[PDB]
Amino acid sequence: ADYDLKFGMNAGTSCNEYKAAEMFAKEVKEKSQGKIEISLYPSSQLGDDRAMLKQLKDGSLDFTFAESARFQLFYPEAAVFALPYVISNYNVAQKALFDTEFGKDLIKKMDKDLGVTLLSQAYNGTRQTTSNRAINSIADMKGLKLRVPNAATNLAYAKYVGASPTPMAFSEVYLALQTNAVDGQENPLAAVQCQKFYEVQKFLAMTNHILNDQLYLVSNETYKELPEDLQKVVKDAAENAAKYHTKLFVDGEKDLVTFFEKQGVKITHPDLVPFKESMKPYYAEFVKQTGQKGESALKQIEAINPKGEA
Ligand SMILES: CC(=O)N[C@H]1[C@H]([C@H](O)[C@H](O)CO)O[C@](O)(C(=O)O)C[C@@H]1O
Ligand SMILES: [Zn+2]
Ligand SMILES: [Zn+2]
């Protein structure tokens, strides 16, 4: 307890994100000879991820998770990461961030403007849609009161497929599902399982609409005060946690549909061509709203070859 550091997250203690942060935490403690202890604060105990990003910026929190897409809060063209159906697989998400001019500049702005250092990137699942009635095709989204996070790209997903979006914090979601204050939500299969949303949702549609990555972030105010050896400890441990993280989500996606079926959830596979078609005006509005910077970021993402990690 030379450094008593803290890691906040929206995920709960059953979740892949917690499990991976636990590995991060335990490895940092070991490979730092006990000089660094990391405590974990899940389930939004410190606020949502907008609050925790601000806490990293002002140095009041040491570590947290964010998606690349979340930086649309500060740079609207960064929403390109979460335009539904634009990023096809995790390979694309990795190259969008690290192997494009747009993404390399985002990392630099994250450092110089927002005070956060990007330690590592993991895969955080592809979002699906649960509901209290079957989504057999895009038609069934009409009138669906669909909970979304407080995030404009999730809002737009629900809106352009014809649903009625209802933003609310992740910690509020189980209650709203349980009482039918909303008709459904959208999250990767992992969250549907670890947050027990399947207990309170009879239907799951494979909409595959947004791919989530996950960034291991550290406050610059924290990172700068660590000796270089301990900086290296934290970076190595972040990278090792991220590979564990990704494997948890990949393996889970081979598996969880079966699990949910055992629980009595009905799985549908709606035709996704009309879903993808309905986003085309949204892409246009994005480019209209964000200008050259958004158009250029989108062209850069679109050109990435979906095949082969890097
Ligand atoms: C790093 C992080 O906190 N991810 C969280 C995301 C993002 O906030 C959202 O996708 C916008 O970026 O929202 C959830 O999926 C949600 O509330 O449904 C929970 C998840 O834990
Ligand atoms: Zn329409
Ligand atoms: Zn299937």
Author numbering: 1 to 310
Can you provide the manuscript's text about this entry?
The tripartite ATP-independent periplasmic (TRAP) transporters use an extra cytoplasmic substrate binding protein (SBP) to transport a wide variety of substrates in bacteria and archaea. It scavenges substrate molecules and delivers them to the membrane transporter.
Heavily intergrown crystals of HiSiaP CLOSED #2 were obtained and single crystalline pieces could be broken off for diffraction data collection at the PETRA III synchrotron (DESY, Hamburg, Germany). A clear solution was found and inspection of the electron density map revealed density at the expected position of the disulfide bond and the sialic acid binding site, demonstrating that the disulfide bond had indeed been formed and the sialic acid molecule had been captured in its binding site. We found that traces of a second conformation of C194 were visible in the electron density. The different position of the engineered cysteines along the edge of the substrate binding pocket explains the higher propensity of CLOSED #2 to spontaneously form a disulfide bond, even without an oxidation agent. Very clearly, HiSiaP CLOSED #2 preferably interacted with the IFS of HiSiaQM.
